[PDB]
């Protein structure tokens, strides 16, 4: 009827990531979109706070490197995880869905890693 010894699932790995990811984007994502997507391109900032030199100065700092990484990657692992499941909820057949979405994640992750060990 219901299988007596079902195969364990591997979801606790993506769920675990998506977890940390959702939490990071819940606490730090709003402020960041403010700065980067609104304040910055509207000059709504004091003096040279968001100037190339200053941003680069930061991005190149250890903490800045770690922060930029997590700020890009964690959200990805959360978001892609969700889109993956959205596919199902919507009844959209996606070949190798898992590889697609989590792959894309890993790729971008790497890409990001390279970017922060610095171009």
């Amino acid at each position: 009827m219901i299988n007596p010894n079902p195969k364990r699932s591997d979801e606790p790995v993506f769920w675990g990531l998506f977890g940390a990811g959702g939490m990071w984007s819940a606490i730090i994502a709003p402020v960041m979109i403010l700065l980067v997507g609104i304040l910055l391109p509207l000059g709504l900032f004091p003096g040279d706070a968001l100037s190339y030199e200053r941003v680069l100065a930061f991005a190149q700092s250890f903490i800045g490197r770690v922060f930029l990484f997590l700020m890009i990657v964690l959200p990805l692992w959360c978001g892609l995880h969700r889109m993956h499941h959205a596919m199902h909820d919507l009844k959209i057949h996606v070949p190798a869905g898992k590889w697609v979405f989590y792959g894309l994640a890993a790729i971008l992750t790497v890409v990001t890693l390279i970017g922060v060990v610095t171009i």
Partner: protein, 243 residues
């Protein structure tokens, strides 16, 4: 005096005549006290004797009442006409095979509920030694989750179950969580397999509608999430147990 009337639309279905369900309409008298179950009784008595449905307690504690009212899973005996003056359409509990009229096949539910071993496991204490010692503080850990009357409304509420009929379900999982969290039970490992399945806690995307409809405020959703956490702990332990 003079009672008001309500045109109730009931989705009938006879597996010996009908190819598919089809609406029927009945005029039913009612007042500020008239419940759906009351209505269904009236219909069977004076309008259509072949109307079949499940019920018993009449006081929302047994759990056989389950059905859909205007696409919302509810307990007929805790549903009142006074609230549906602008139309009421009654169908068999969603996400279950319609057997006849308002009766659906609850087999999956039952098997699911059975699969998680809902019983104290592994405690050697015997009657003569007295009862276990459990504090209020300890009981609080699972109390809420023990109030499930197995009505099955949560299953008609869960979209993941409607998409994946193999999903053991909200109730099932809550029941399981109920025993896992009982300081008197020692059979958590006997249950994990099922909760760790893809058809277990991991089939839930926290839509949360189940907790929204639970007539007994068990909040199964909260149980599943908590399950996910335990399942995840289990997965780690298993990864580090190369023993």
């Amino acid at each position: 005096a003079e009672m008001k009337n309500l045109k109730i639309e009931v989705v009938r279905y006879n597996p010996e005549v009908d190819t598919a369900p089809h609406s029927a309409f009945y005029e039913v008298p009612y007042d500020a006290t008239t419940s759906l179950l009351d209505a269904l009784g009236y219909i069977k008595d004076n309008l259509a004797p072949d109307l079949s449905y499940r019920w018993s307690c009449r006081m929302a504690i047994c759990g056989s009442c389950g059905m859909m009212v205007n696409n919302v899973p509810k307990l007929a005996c805790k549903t009142f006409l006074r609230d549906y003056t602008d139309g009421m359409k009654v169908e068999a509990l969603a996400n279950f095979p319609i057997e006849r009229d308002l009766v659906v096949d609850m087999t999956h539910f039952i098997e699911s509920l059975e699969a998680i071993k809902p019983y104290i496991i592994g405690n050697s204490r015997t009657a003569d030694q007295g009862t276990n010692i459990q504090t209020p503080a300890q009981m609080a850990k699972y109390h809420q989750f023990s109030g499930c009357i197995n009505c099955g409304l949560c299953y008609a509420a869960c979209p993941q179950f409607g998409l994946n009929p193999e999903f053991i379900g909200p109730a099932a999982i809550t029941l399981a969580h109920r025993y896992n969290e009982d300081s008197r039970d020692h059979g958590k490992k006997e249950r994990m397999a099922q909760l760790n399945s893809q058809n277990g806690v991991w089939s839930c995307t926290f839509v949360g509608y189940c907790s929204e409809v639970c007539p007994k405020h068990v909040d199964p959703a909260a149980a599943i999430q908590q399950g996910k956490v335990e399942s995840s702990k289990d997965f780690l332990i298993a990864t580090l147990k190369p023993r």
